[PDB]
Structures are given as structure tokens and as C-alpha cells.
Ligand binder design. Structure first.
Ligand SMILES: CCCCCCCCCCCCCCCCCC(=O)OC[C@H](COP(=O)([O-])OCC(O)COP(=O)([O-])OC[C@@H](COC(=O)CCCCCCCCCCCCCCCCC)OC(=O)CCCCCCCCCCCCCCCCC)OC(=O)CCCCCCCCCCCCCCCCC
Ligand SMILES: CCCCCCCCCCC[C@H](O)CC(=O)SCCNC(=O)CCNC(=O)[C@H](O)C(C)(C)COP(=O)(O)O
Ligand code: SF4
Ligand code: SF4
Ligand code: SF4
Ligand SMILES: [K+]
Ligand SMILES: [Zn+2]
Lengths: 238, 95, 176, 115, 129, 145, 96, 209, 115
């Protein structure tokens, strides 16, 4: 849905109201999770002071996202280098102190609630307008002008056969993906197709640090360390 | 499928909160699945005059990467001014 | 801004210490969990029984493809190869020919339902709304060959789900 | 120009040296994998396969190149003695299922248009 | 320039030992180094400014189930753009491919004059514009 | 060119004229050729193609029903910027992006014109004239096409 | 429409039909050769021709945005009814 | 801004980074060969291969740079260029919320010193680059394949490598084990010559060679 | 100074109970290791122009919190780390000899994009 130059098409009528109904209910379940585990002694011992990573080594290891915010490093791409309209949205970034497995679990759960504040603002400050860049040489024209106007059809033909030819150049854009600092390195020769696309996966740098974390911990801890790391192997294996 | 009031108290008491105010199961509050036909807006450039592409394009306005030194006193300069330490939260300080 | 998450130093007053001692000795947060699940036991299950009732969808759902045809009966596909040119999985394979009437139709329209990933680009591609995924998410087969659709199967799907595609497209033709 | 940066070896001779302890390690390595990996070939049937790669890789003369595959051979040896490979991976060296390919021109001519 | 024990190697570069190209596809295959022709039905000449190396075409048989274009030569849809010819060919010997080189066909410079369309004696007077 | 159309009127339609079983003519598409016309009157000598009228219509064609045949008649197809003069034998066999272009020499004549054999999936749909200046310029005979 | 091959197969709209030997025919046995009966070729012929009186006629194909790109068919050649290249609907002048 | 489509330009950042470009160039003139800032405010530090270790330590340790996070470590294989592979590092400076890109060139044979010491993140990125491209990295803790299958030959991301590869897999019953066979597609990859024959960007027009 | 900071926030780094003294001795070490480098080197001018000011503020400002704003480097604990890192770099930069003209020009068209 999220395409270059804007989203594919506008939301259906009544979608935002359905968002509001769910967001009302959700905070009444996030605390419900916290009731189940956050104060549970068994969950605490299985997660407190376990898989602890310090500040400098985590920073040196190429970590990002929770691995940084969990150990005390107050870094978040949504705040430091805000992309899109993330600047016009107020929110807090939970920062841990111990840096262990447990502190990240609160960091993720607190990220839940902070996201709910972002959703509340996005619904309340939705602006009118189109959903894709007006430039038809970049985003395909709507089907209405497709079937009546010469230029729209020509552009739609070439866009879906050739595609927009981007200027030559290379860039690395990273965003605060829920796992971490997901980033892509796109090198373009100038034709209608990319020349090289390196995919900075937040879990790639993380998983290299599995050995550094699990030092002296038992195997059951390694199972715990895998979970907090929040790795999905589509991103790391690319 | 509405719970009997007898167990409405049971679920409320056993969890120490009012479940019936907001439940996970959806009900008639959802938006209707059939909606009137929408009229979508037009973009800012949908003007039938003074919309020349030469003053509107974005691709043809990218210059080649500007070169500042090639291998072919001055004050020390940081890449950007150092970040300002984030202030503590106001809505919710220390948890 | 940022919010600290967990460093809350507990108080050492005798009331607080006995509270924690009672909590550790007489397991309370464990009982808090038990009371939680019991409360979450007497709720209404979120399950729905299968095919007798089915889950909810939206008119723009993407599923099994179909090749519709005009109200007259003539097929919409004029074989412009746009869908093949945009197919991310290169599942579209079509060849055209000047038909006997002189019109411009396709001899072959094999869609390999084992390659394409239901991007929906094809329904966005053809300017005559020829190819479109139907609402039928259900077409699972017992053999691999059955999934490899040709033009004939596509038209049959078009003739079967035509009532849905006309209605669904009617709803969403304004959003696009 | 002609001056290039060498990887480890400083001429052919120690480049010829490094291929030796690879063969030294590989030869010692054959009989235990045949036992550990539960292979179907004989202990004798492994040494030739270890051997035949080596003068299959014989036209190479550049010292940098020679040192480059001695690392690849060492890595392949590395990923073998920790049972990181499997029976299928090792057996892929023995081109077993693939039917023999002809060599004479006439047989090439009979099967299909290909050199 | 590096003081890193610069050995003067002289043997021509050959990395075919490492690229992993199977024995059939390294000697038998012949690559062609040429500048692509201008598509005659078009008029622009942007596609004829980069040398390209492509491999010879192999068997293309139709699949039994449904009429396909199944092939068994991996080096079929592999073209490589190159700035200049000597740089393109330097890749060929380095990868040990028996190459064939063409020459950069360029349009010869013509002389066009609108005044010629209406001459007094020369038989180049255009009959209609 | 722009990315949108400000035209708010009805487009003109032009009747098709038949000038060959080898060249298609959807004359409503082409725009004021002077390319078909010059090629017929300079490279082929056949003075049958022309323009008829003035104004927006000024129909371009042959007026009377004539049959444009010459040894080089087929070259009007690849000099047409617009898809009006199109190869009738081609007739939407395939589309440009999917086909692969290989360079060869025609053997039908003894001139040896350089041609591009556009093939896809293991079949030949089109034969295009390459450029060789002294050999064949950029033209090939209809026999070779 | 759908005819029957000498072997017994059903010719499709494209005219494809596995011939007598055609070892590929084994697949259809114990199965069926899927053929669509609503042949597009003869499903457009019976549609009548519009007798609209003008020189240039647009064809949206019905439904506006639901149809096909608006093309203008020239109804001037008084021998053959103009047809839209997108849908095949025949248009003709009302014979003056 | 009347223009609603064109991405806004940040000249202050452009001037700021360009000054830092002169900074790094002056401090290390031995390795830095070229420095440029793109139109979208990204600084590329073109260094010589032997400068991989020295230059990286400078941006990681110098007080005025403080780039203490290895974003990524990639290479773009350009068959054209004499030394085809081009190793690219991306560094993020937490203190100065800026990103830098040091790029170096390397052929198939010449090795590059492993940046594991200066950036311990590079260790796993080090293995990937060799596995996908074949750039061997000197004095590395453990250089090994990380992505390709065990015993897989060749370097896949290399341009000369075919899209489908050379080796397939299937189960063969006479051996009761997965076996490798030469690649044999049921459908060849339909390559598309989707390149416009008309120049797209007069700004980036190459000189008339 | 008040009550010493319980923690610096970041796990690892410990609160320095002798902040100013560590800054002074570290910054003096910087000016020493720099002193072993030729003056014309640009590394000397910028590092001494950076450290000597930092040494100037730490001596002048005795309050820890005002010192943090003085060098805008977060808390003191990460300041002593950076001052340590500059020490290692300066100690390692003297052997690297990064002030002579570049080792050599890169090949003709190694840069330039597109090809
Ligand atoms: C402990 C058991 C105590 C005796 C039975 C009372 C009981 O459990 O009532 C459950 C009954 C049903 O649950 P609910 O969530 O309140 O019902 C909400 C809707 O009204 C529910 O609306 P509904 O439309 O689902 O109501 C219809 C429902 C109504 O079902 C009932 O009333 C269950 C009782 C059998 C009939 O009956 C059915 O669905 C038919 C299927 C019955 C399945 C088999 C039941 C076996 C019962 C035990 C057999 C012997 C052992 O709950 C109450 O009435 C609360 C009072 C509990 C008193 C406990 C005293 C100790
Ligand atoms: C079961 C499976 C088990 C595992 C199965 C085998 C697994 C793979 C084993 C390694 C295979 C790898 O490709 C090659 C390598 O390691 S090294 C090549 C050495 N290349 C040279 O040394 C230069 C060229 N050759 C010569 O110089 C001489 O001709 C020669 C050395 C042959 C004889 O020396 P002589 O002095 O003439
Ligand atoms: S749905 Fe997408 S992937 Fe599948 S055939 Fe259509 S265009 Fe291709
Ligand atoms: S299905 Fe659509 S995109 Fe594909 S050929 Fe037909 S009209 Fe074109
Ligand atoms: S067919 Fe081509 S050359 Fe002829 S009139 Fe039309 S656009 Fe012009
Ligand atoms: K043409
Ligand atoms: Zn129509």
C-alpha cells in the first residue's frame, strides 16, 4: 500500500471510526498483559538481569532500536531525525536503566502505549487532500483520467511497463522500524530499475551479538534472549 | 454469542476492573459495511492553467553530487551541532 | 522527550516491607494472575465456527483471479500485456493474435497461481479492468497442476464470480 | 602495474606449500567422515575425490589466486569436520544422479544442438 | 605506494578458478561484445552509448504441460553494460570467455539544407512538404 | 511534456485507408507525417503517398484507392513515430519489452543487409533493419522484412 | 461456439485441439478438458449496430469509468460499420 | 513554498556537512581521495583501500566526529570499473545526529583489512560481503559463508552470476537423499528491455566521449 | 557537587567521583601526545584547538552540572570516555603518519556514477 510518492488509494469511508473503537479498547488490554507478567515473580526471574548488554558494546555492535533504548542510550530515529510528519506528533520514548532482558520487555510494552498516543493524534489531525504525489510521471494517475485524457493514459502505460526513471545516485535512508533501525541503501544507475539495494536489517546486527549476550547463561536463557531480540528471519537472511 | 449480571460481577471483581465498559468482542458499534459513494479530492496541480511542468517537476531539479575537494587557521567544525539532551517527560515521569 | 521505565526504588517503611514480605510469603501476584484468567474465563470466546459462518472482509479483497467480459459478452482483455509487464513474479504469460473478427484478443492467458503473490497490480494495470482478483480466497487444490491456470479457467472464474466482481468493483471504483 | 598485493603467499613455492597441508589435512580427514557421516563410499573412494579436485585445479599459476582457493578449501574443510555439512552436501561432490554426459562430437550431434 | 610487499605478478588475470562457473559454461560459451543497435522504429539514441556483453543463445524447448519457453542454459538472460570496449574485453579474458568484438557503429555525419528542397536546376526539389 | 491533459473537447477521428496487405493504417492516430510522404517520394520514388486538404483534418494518404507496393515499401513502418503505419503481418504478435533482439545478416538478397532478429520464447515475430551506412543504411527490402 | 474434435475433444475459442496421436491427451482422460462455452467471438456478432447519425462517435463501453478509454470511431466509410477496437460494438451512420 | 511536490531543500545542513567534508579531508590527506555532498545532504568520503582501518578509527574516536555506530557494510559490484567491487560503509554519529559514508574500491584479488577492531559490528557484515561477492577481508576473526548453502560455489551477488544460478535441488529415490542437478527451468526468466531510448536527465549527462 | 549521581543512566559507565581531575590529566595527556606530531599537520591544530578549550572550561567551571552544558557532551562520564578515545586515536595517529600526500591517485574512472 505504501508506495513511493504516497499511498495507493484513500481509506474506505468509516475506517477511521473503526480505528477509534479499537484504540479505546486496546489500553484496557495492554495493562492486562502487564497484570499477567510484569509483576509476576516467575516472569521476573526468567527475565530480570538476564542477557544484560552494556552501553558502549551495544553501540559498537551496531545495535539499534530497543537494544539502544533498553540499555539507557536515549536514541530514536522518530525524534532525532524525524521522517514524514513524525515531528508534528508528540510522544515519549521509554528508556531503560538495567539494559537486561526485563528492561526491554517494559520498553516494548511502554512503546505500545506511546504508539496509542500517536494513533490518537493521527486520527484527530487527519488533513484533507490527495493520497499520492500529483506528479503523474511518478505516481500513476487515477482511473478516471486514465480513460479520457491522452497524457494520463500515456503516463499510466509507461509507468506500469517501464516505470519512473529515478536520477542516478545512492542514498541510505533508515527509519525507526518496530524492530529497530531498518534502512535501505539504494544505488541507481539512472535507468528505470535499481542497480543495487542493500537492506540494513535491524536483526542482522542484533543477532551477531547473541554470543556476547549469552555468556554464562544457560540454554533456557538463550531461548529468552532470542525472544527479546525480536528477530524475524526474512529480514536478516534478506 | 450478554453475560448474566451474576457473573458480570465475577469477571469484573476477579480482574479488578469494569470489563463491560469496553470489551474485546466487537458489537453494533462497528461502522456499517456499506457506505455511500465517496467523492475524492483533486491534487494541488489539478489547475487548467499556470501548471507548466517546467515549474513543477521534481526529478529534473536534482543536481549531480556537489564536489568540494578532489585529490586530482580554520576553526574545528562538527558535522552538526551536538544534540540537546532530551528533557524528562511531563505527562508521565518515572514509571 | 523520554520517560524512564523501571528504576522505582521501593520504600523501606515497615508497612512497605511487610507488604512485600506478605507478597513473597503469601503469593499475591501469582493469585492476581489466577484471578485474572478466571475473569477472562467467563468471557465470550472470540471464535467463529467455520464455513457455517465466515470471517469479515472488505470489497477490495484480493483473491482468485478472473477474466471478466463486457455487458455484451465480449471479453475485456485486449491483450495489452501491461499486466505481464508489471507482474512482480512474472506469472502472467500471454500471446495475442488478430482474431477472425479482426478484434485484438489473446490466444493464451496462463496465469500461474503458484508464482504470483496477489499484489493486485494487474487489476490496476489493464485500462479495461480485464484481469481482477475475485473475492474467492478459497480455491485450494489437491495437485500442483490444478493451480496453474490457463485462459480458459480464468474465463470460467470470470463467469462464476461475475456477480461479486461487478458489485465489488462498483463499490471501490470511486476510491481509485 | 605488475606489482600487486599478495594475500599470504610471497611466491609460488609457499603457495605450493599451502596446498600441501590442505592435502595433509584432507587426507587425514577422509576416514573419519566416512565413519561419522555414515557415507556409502569406501575410505579409498574418498581420497581420489579429495585428490582429483587438486590437479583439476592445476592450470592456476597466480600466487594470489592459489592462496585464495586454499582458504576456500580450508573453509570447506572447516565446515566439514564440525558436521556442519550433511550427507547430501558431501555426496554432491560425487555426481551420482546426474547421468554421464557424452564427450565425442558424434554423440553431441545426436542428442541436441550444443557444443 | 603501499609498502605492502608489492610482488610483480605478470601472468594475465584469470579468476575462472574461483567464480564457480561449471566446466560446460566456461569454455564452450562464446560472448559477444557490441554496442546495441538503435531501435529502428524509434528515433532516440540513448540505448546506443554503452558497450554490452551477452552470451550465445541455446536450446528453447516447450514444456509438455503448458506451452512454455523452458531452457537449461543459466547464462541466457545475462547482459552486462560496459563504458568502453577495452574495459569490456578486459572482463572477458579475466573470466576466460572466448569473446567476439564488433566495432562501434556510429551515424556518419550528414549535410542537411532546407534550401535544397527548392533548387533552380539541381534535381533535389521536393515535390511536396 | 506535461503529466495531465487540459483538453476539454471532442477528439477528431480519421477514416482508415488501405494501402497494403503488409502495412496497417489506423490513420486516426498519425500526426501530419511528412515522413511517409518524403520516404515515398525520395527513397522509393513511388509518388502515391501525400496529404489531402488543409486544417485539422488534411487527410494524409493516397486519395484514390491505390496500393503502395515497392521493394522498399515496408520501411514506412519503422519510420512511423506514431502507431498508424504498422506491420500488418506483425498484428500484435508481441510487445517490445518482452522480445529479445539479436543481430544478424539477411540472406534473402545478396546485398547482405544488417538486420535485427527480434525473438521471444523461441520464435521470430519481427525482422528489423539495423544500421550499417554503406551496406544498407537503415532500410531493408519487404522481401527481407 | 464449442464444437467437437474428431477424437472427441472440444475446440476452444482459439481453436486449440489436441490431435489424434497427441500423447498429451492422456491428461484429459479421467478428467475433463476445461472449455468456456460463452465464446467471445460469436457473443458480440449478434449485438445490433447503432444507427446514430453523426460523423464522429465516442464509445465509453458503458459505465463511464467502468468501461474502456474513450475512443472516437469515424463513421464515414459507407461500406463497413465502424467498430470500437476495445469492445467490438459496431457503429454506423443511418445510411444518410 | 509554492511547489507542493518537490522535496524541500536544507541548505544549512548542506553547508554544514560540506564544511565537515573539508575537515576530514584536511586531517587525513593520505587516504581521503574525494569528498562530496549529494543534493539530498549525504556526505561520501572517498578513501583509498589501505585507509579502511585508519580513517574509520578517526571518525569513530575523534571528538568532533564521534561516529560510533556502524549502520551497514555493503559493496556494489561494478563490472565496468577496473577494480569491480566497491566496499561501502555507513556510519551514524549519535552526538551530532549525522550520517557519513566512507567508500573504497577493491578488485577480486586484493584484500581489505577487516574493520572488526574499529567496529565489532563489521564482523558479521564482513562474512556476508565475502560470501555474496568474494571480496576477501584480511586478518578477520573467522571468515566463512553466512548466507549461501553449505558447499555452495560461486559468489551470487556478483553480476556475472546468473539470476537463477547453476545448481538445483530435488529428492532422488535411488539415493534416498536430496541431490544437486544442473539448473533446468520450466520457464526461462523473460528479460525485459525496458529502457527508454531518450535521455532522461540533462543534468547528469555524461561528457561526449 | 552535592550528592553524587546514583547512576549515569547508561549501563556500563560508572559515576566518576573525581570528574574534574580526570578531565585535567586526560586533556594534558592530549596536548602531550599531540606535541609528538609535526606542527604543520592539520591534526595538531584542530585537536589542540579542541582539547585546550575543553581543558579551559573544566578548569574555569568547578560545578559539574554547569560543566556538562559547557562542553555539551551529556554527563561527565561520557565526556571522560570521549577524552579517553581522543587519547587512543592521537596515540595511534602518530604512527599511522596521515599527513604526507595521498598514497596514490585512484584509477582513472574508479569514481563517476553512472558508468
Ligand atoms: C456450575 C454449574 C451450576 C449449575 C448450572 C448453572 C450454570 O452453570 O449456569 C450457567 C449460566 C450460563 O452462563 P452465562 O455466561 O451467564 O450465560 C450468558 C448467556 O445468557 C448465555 O445465553 P445462551 O443463549 O448461550 O443460553 C443457552 C444456554 C443456557 O445454558 C445453561 O443455562 C446451562 C445449564 C444447563 C441448561 O444453553 C445452551 O446453550 C444449550 C447447550 C447446553 C450445554 C450443556 C450444559 C450442561 C450443564 C450441566 C449438566 C450437568 C453437569 O450462568 C449463570 O446462569 C450464572 C449463575 C451460575 C450459578 C452457579 C451456582 C453454583
Ligand atoms: C568426500 C569429499 C571430501 C573432500 C573433497 C575435496 C573438497 C575440496 C578440496 C579443495 C579443492 C580446491 O578447489 C583446490 C584447493 O584446495 S588447492 C589447488 C592447488 N593448486 C596449486 O597448487 C597450483 C596449481 N597446481 C600445481 O601447481 C600442481 O600441478 C599441483 C599442486 C596440482 C601438483 O603439484 P606438483 O608440484 O606439480
Ligand atoms: S496478482 Fe500480482 S503477482 Fe499475481 S499475477 Fe497478478 S500482477 Fe502478477
Ligand atoms: S488482463 Fe489487463 S493488463 Fe493484462 S493484457 Fe488484458 S487488459 Fe492488458
Ligand atoms: S503514420 Fe507516422 S509518419 Fe505517417 S502520418 Fe501518421 S505519424 Fe506521420
Ligand atoms: K511505426
Ligand atoms: Zn467500445
Amino acid at each position: 500500500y505504501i508506495r513511493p510518492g504516497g499511498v495507493h488509494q484513500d481509506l474506505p469511508l468509516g475506517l477511521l471510526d473503526d480505528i477509534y473503537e479499537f484504540s479505546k479498547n486496546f489500553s484496557f488490554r495492554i495493562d492486562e498483559l502487564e497484570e499477567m507478567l510484569t509483576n509476576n515473580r516467575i516472569w521476573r526471574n526468567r527475565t530480570v538481569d538476564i542477557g544484560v548488554v552494556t552501553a558502549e558494546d551495544a553501540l559498537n555492535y551496531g545495535f539499534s532500536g530497543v537494544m539502544l533504548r533498553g540499555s539507557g542510550i536515549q536514541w530514536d530515529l522518530r525524534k532525532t531525525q524525524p521522517y514524514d510528519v513524525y515531528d508534528q506528533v508528540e510522544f515519549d520514548v521509554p528508556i531503560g536503566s538495567r539494559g537486561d532482558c526485563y528492561d526491554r520487555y517494559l520498553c516494548r510494552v511502554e512503546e505500545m502505549r506511546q504508539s496509542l498516543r500517536i494513533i490518537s493524534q493521527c486520527l484527530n489531525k487527519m488533513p484533507p487532500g490527495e493520497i499520492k504525489v500529483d506528479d503523474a510521471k511518478v505516481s500513476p494517475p487515477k482511473r478516471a483520467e486514465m480513460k479520457t485524457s491522452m497524457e494520463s493514459l500515456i503516463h499510466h502505460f509507461k509507468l506500469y511497463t517501464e516505470g519512473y526513471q529515478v536520477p542516478p545516485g545512492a542514498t541510505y535512508t533508515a527509519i525507526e522500524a518496530p524492530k529497530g533501525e531498518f534502512g535501505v541503501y539504494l544505488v541507481s544507475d539512472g535507468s528505470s530499475r535499481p542497480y543495487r539495494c542493500k537492506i540494513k536489517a535491524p536483526g542482522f546486527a542484533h543477532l551477531a551479538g547473541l554470543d556476547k549476550m549469552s555468556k554464562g547463561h544457560m540454554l533456557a536463557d538463550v531461548v529468552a534472549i532470542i525472544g527479546t531480540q525480536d528477530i524475524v528471519f526474512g529480514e536478516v537472511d534478506r | 454469542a450478554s453475560a448474566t449480571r451474576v457473573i458480570q460481577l465475577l469477571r469484573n471483581w476477579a480482574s479488578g476492573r469494569d470489563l463491560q465498559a469496553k470489551l474485546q468482542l466487537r458489537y453494533q458499534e462497528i461502522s456499517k459495511r456499506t457506505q455511500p459513494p465517496p467523492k475524492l479530492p483533486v491534487g494541488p496541480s489539478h489547475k487548467l492553467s499556470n501548471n507548466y511542468y517546467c515549474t513543477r517537476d521534481g526529478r529534473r531539479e536534482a543536481m549531480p553530487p556537489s564536489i568540494v575537494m578532489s585529490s586530482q587557521e580554520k576553526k574545528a567544525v562538527t558535522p552538526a551541532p551536538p544534540i540537546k539532551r532530551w528533557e524528562l517527560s511531563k505527562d508521565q515521569p518515572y514509571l | 522527550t523520554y520517560k524512564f521505565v523501571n528504576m522505582r526504588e521501593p520504600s523501606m517503611d515497615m508497612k512497605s516491607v511487610t507488604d512485600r514480605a506478605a507478597q513473597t510469603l503469601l503469593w499475591t501476584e501469582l493469585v492476581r494472575g489466577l484471578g485474572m484468567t478466571l475473569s477472562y474465563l467467563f468471557r465470550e470466546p472470540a471464535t467463529i465456527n467455520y464455513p457455517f459462518e465466515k470471517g469479515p472482509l472488505s470489497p477490495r479483497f484480493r483473491g482468485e483471479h478472473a477474466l471478466r467480459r463486457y455487458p455484451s459478452g465480449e471479453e475485456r482483455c485486449i491483450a495489452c500485456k501491461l499486466c505481464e509487464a508489471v507482474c512482480p513474479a512474472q506469472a502472467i504469460t500471454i500471446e495475442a493474435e488478430p482474431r477472425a473478427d479482426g478484434s485484438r484478443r489473446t490466444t493464451r492467458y496462463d496465469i500461474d497461481m503458484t508464482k504470483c503473490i496477489y499484489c493486485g497490480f494487474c487489476q490496476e494495470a489493464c485500462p479495461v479492468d480485464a484481469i481482477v482478483e475475485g473475492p474467492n480466497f478459497e480455491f485450494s487444490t489437491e495437485t500442483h497442476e490444478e493451480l496453474l491456470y490457463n485462459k480458459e479457467k480464468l474465463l470460467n472464474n470470470g463467469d462464476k464470480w461475475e456477480a461479486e466482481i461487478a458489485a465489488n468493483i462498483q463499490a471501490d471504483y470511486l476510491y481509485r | 602495474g605488475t606489482s600487486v598485493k599478495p594475500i599470504f603467499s610471497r611466491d609460488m613455492n609457499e603457495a605450493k606449500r599451502r596446498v600441501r597441508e590442505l592435502y595433509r589435512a584432507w587426507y587425514r580427514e577422509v576416514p573419519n567422515t566416512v565413519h561419522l557421516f555414515q557415507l556409502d563410499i569406501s575410505v579409498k573412494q574418498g581420497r581420489d575425490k579429495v585428490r582429483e579436485m587438486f590437479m583439476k585445479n592445476a592450470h592456476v599459476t597466480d600466487p594470489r589466486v592459489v592462496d585464495l582457493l586454499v582458504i576456500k578449501g580450508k573453509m570447506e574443510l572447516e565446515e566439514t569436520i564440525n558436521v556442519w555439512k550433511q550427507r547430501t552436501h558431501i555426496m554432491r561432490f560425487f555426481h551420482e544422479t546426474e547421468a554421464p554426459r557424452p564427450t565425442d562430437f558424434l554423440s553431441k550431434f545426436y542428442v541436441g544442438h550444443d557444443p | 605506494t603501499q609498502d605492502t610487499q608489492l610482488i610483480a605478478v605478470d601472468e594475465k588475470l584469470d579468476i575462472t578458478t574461483l567464480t564457480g562457473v561449471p566446466e560446460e559454461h566456461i569454455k564452450t560459451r562464446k560472448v559477444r561484445i557490441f554496442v546495441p543497435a538503435r531501435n529502428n522504429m524509434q528515433s532516440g539514441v540513448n540505448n546506443t552509448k554503452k558497450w554490452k556483453m551477452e552470451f550465445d543463445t541455446r536450446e528453447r524447448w516447450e514444456n509438455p504441460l503448458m506451452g512454455w519457453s523452458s531452457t537449461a542454459d543459466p547464462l541466457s538472460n545475462l547482459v552486462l553494460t560496459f563504458s568502453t570496449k577495452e574495459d569490456a574485453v578486459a572482463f572477458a579474458e579475466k573470466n576466460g570467455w572466448s569473446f567476439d568484438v564488433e566495432e562501434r557503429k556510429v551515424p556518419k555525419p550528414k549535410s542537411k539544407s532546407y534550401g535544397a528542397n527548392f533548387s533552380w536546376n539541381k534535381r533535389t526539389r521536393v515535390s511536396t512538404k | 511534456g506535461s503529466d495531465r491533459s487540459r483538453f476539454l473537447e471532442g477528439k477528431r477521428a480519421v477514416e482508415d485507408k488501405n494501402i497494403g496487405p503488409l502495412v496497417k493504417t489506423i490513420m486516426t492516430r498519425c500526426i501530419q507525417c511528412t515522413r511517409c510522404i518524403r520516404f515515398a517520394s525520395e527513397i522509393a520514388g513511388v509518388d502515391d503517398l501525400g496529404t489531402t486538404g488543409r486544417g485539422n483534418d488534411m487527410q494524409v494518404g493516397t486519395y484514390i484507392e491505390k496500393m503502395f507496393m515497392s521493394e522498399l515499401s515496408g520501411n514506412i513502418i519503422d519510420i512511423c513515430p506514431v502507431g498508424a503505419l504498422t506491420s500488418k503481418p506483425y498484428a500484435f504478435t508481441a510487445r517490445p519489452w518482452e522480445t529479445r533482439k539479436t543481430e544478424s545478416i539477411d540472406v534473402m538478397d545478396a546485398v547482405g543487409s544488417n538486420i535485427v532478429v527480434s525473438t521471444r520464447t523461441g520464435e521470430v515475430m519481427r525482422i528489423l533493419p539495423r544500421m550499417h551506412e554503406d551496406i544498407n543504411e537503415e532500410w531493408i527490402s519487404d522481401k527481407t522484412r | 461456439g464449442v464444437r467437437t474434435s474428431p477424437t472427441g475433444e472440444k475446440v476452444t475459442h482459439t481453436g486449440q485441439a489436441y490431435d489424434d496421436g497427441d500423447y498429451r491427451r492422456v491428461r484429459f482422460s479421467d478428467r475433463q478438458k476445461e472449455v468456456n462455452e460463452n465464446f467471445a467471438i460469436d457473443l458480440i456478432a449478434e449485438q445490433p449496430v447503432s444507427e446514430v447519425g453523426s460523423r464522429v462517435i465516442s464509445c465509453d463501453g458503458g459505465g463511464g469509468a467502468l468501461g474502456h478509454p474513450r475512443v472516437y470511431i469515424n463513421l464515414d466509410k459507407e461500406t463497413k460499420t465502424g467498430t470500437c477496437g476495445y469492445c467490438g460494438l459496431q457503429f454506423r451512420q443511418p445510411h444518410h | 513554498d509554492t511547489r507542493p511536490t518537490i522535496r524541500p531543500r536544507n541548505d544549512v545542513v548542506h553547508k554544514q556537512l560540506s564544511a565537515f567534508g573539508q575537515y576530514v579531508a584536511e586531517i587525513l590527506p593520505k587516504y581521503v581521495q574525494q569528498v562530496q555532498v549529494s543534493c539530498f545532504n549525504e556526505l561520501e568520503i572517498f578513501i583509498h583501500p589501505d585507509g579502511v582501518i585508519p580513517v574509520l578509527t578517526f571518525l569513530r574516536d575523534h571528538t568532533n566526529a564521534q561516529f560510533k555506530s556502524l549502520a551497514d557494510l555493503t559493496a556494489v559490484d561494478v563490472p565496468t570499473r577496473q577494480n569491480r567491487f566497491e566496499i561501502v560503509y555507513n556510519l551514524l554519529s549519535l552526538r551530532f545526529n549525522s550520517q557519513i559514508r566512507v567508500k573504497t574500491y577493491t578488485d577480486e584479488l586484493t584484500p581489505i583489512e577487516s574493520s572488526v577492531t574499529v567496529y565489532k559490528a563489521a564482523n558479521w557484515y564482513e562474512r556476508e560481503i565475502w560470501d555474496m561477492f568474494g571480496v576477501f577481508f584480511a586478518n578477520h576473526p573467522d571468515l566463512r559463508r553466512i548466507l549461501t548453502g553449505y558447499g555452495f560455489e560461486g559468489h551470487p551477488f556478483r553480476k556475472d552470476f546468473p539470476l537463477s544460478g547453476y545448481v538445483e535441488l530435488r529428492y532422488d529415490d535411488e539415493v534416498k537423499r536430496v541431490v544437486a542437478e544442473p539448473v533446468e527451468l520450466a520457464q526461462e526468466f523473460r528479460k525485459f528491455d525496458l529502457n527508454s531510448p531518450w535521455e532522461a536527465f540533462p543534468a547528469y549527462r555524461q561528457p561526449p566521449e | 557537587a552535592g550528592l553524587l549521581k546514583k547512576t549515569t543512566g547508561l549501563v556500563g559507565l560508572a559515576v566518576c567521583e573525581t570528574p574534574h581531575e580526570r578531565l585535567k590529566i586526560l586533556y594534558t595527556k592530549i596536548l602531550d601526545v599531540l606535541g609528538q606530531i609535526p606542527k604543520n599537520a592539520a591534526y595538531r591544530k584542530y585537536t589542540e584547538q579542541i582539547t585546550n578549550e575543553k581543558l579551559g572550561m573544566v578548569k574555569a567551571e568547578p560545578d559539574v552540572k554547569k560543566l556538562e552544558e559547557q562542553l555539551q557532551g551529556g554527563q561527565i562520564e561520557e565526556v571522560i570516555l570521549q577524552a579517553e578515545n581522543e587519547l587512543s586515536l592521537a596515540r595511534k595517529m602518530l604512527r599511522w603518519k596521515p599527513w604526507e600526500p595521498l598514497v596514490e591517485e585512484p584509477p582513472a574512472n574508479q569514481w563517476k556514477w553512472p558508468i
